[PDB]
Amino acid sequence: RLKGLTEDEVQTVVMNWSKRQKFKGRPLFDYIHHSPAAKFKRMGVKAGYPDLIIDIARGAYHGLRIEIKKDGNSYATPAQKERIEMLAKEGYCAVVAKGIDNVISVIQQYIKLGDFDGVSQLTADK
Amino acid sequence: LKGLTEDEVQTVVMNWSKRQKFKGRPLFDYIHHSPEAAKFKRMGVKAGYPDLIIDIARGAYHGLRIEIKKDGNSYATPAQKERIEMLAKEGYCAVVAKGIDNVISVIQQYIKLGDFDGVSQL
Ligand SMILES: [Mg+2]
Ligand SMILES: [Mg+2]
């Protein structure tokens, strides 16, 4: 019982946090895009695309993608997992992160990788 | 009398990508399109974000972004141009392309740059 935060709530807090950080002289928020029936599919909209797009290359990666879950009792779907694998294979940092604190932590760690070098990973294995 | 709509232009480009291959699968699989207003903005939706996201790094670029216009008489908004500048600055290939043929030609030239080398420009 007692429900946790909704996913909309988790994402909104993360965005509000990003408005208070800076990257290259502007709010980090400016570098974050959220990609929110049959027509959309033929228009190219991909089911299970990660919630957050961060268009900055750092360390080993060409960009950052985050699939947000509201808490630890929510799980990525097969389409989300497949899209994450496709992104990783193409050299993007693409991860599931659950809850506000973990999403913020990933964004912090990603930026902290430093300038693109094609080498520095988020984790030992990925 | 009116030319093609932007929806129709984008759909033809997507249908074209379905018939192209990249690393064993349709090029279409690598293309993403991101489609009250206040809520979406505080959720992080950026007005003026390019229509087409291609999550492949080629030549000098970390990825490809295309702002589509339906024909030669249509032009980028200030927000669209600002986003394009931000993308280019971070090492993405970000362009305005107008009409079906030009959009397809940009995708063709981008893929042809080859594997990411950090130097080969469009
Ligand atoms: Mg999610
Ligand atoms: Mg457009």
Author numbering:
A (entry chain E): 4 to 39, 59 to 148
B (entry chain A): 5 to 39, 58 to 144
Sentences from the paper on this structure:
However, we were able to solve the first VRR-Nuc domain structures using single-domain proteins derived from three bacteria and bacteriophage as surrogates: Psychrobacter (psNUC); Streptococcus equi bacteriophage P9 (stNUC); and Salmonella enteritidis typing phage 3 (saNUC). Crystal structures of three representatives show that they structurally resemble Holliday junction resolvases (HJRs), are dimeric in solution, and are able to cleave symmetric four-way junctions. DALI searches show that the structures with greatest similarity to the VRR-Nuc domains are all Holliday-junction-resolving enzymes exemplified by Hjc. As dimers, bacterial VRR-Nuc domains have two active sites and a DNA-binding surface with 2-fold symmetry that are well suited to the recognition and symmetrical, bilateral cleavage of Holliday junctions.
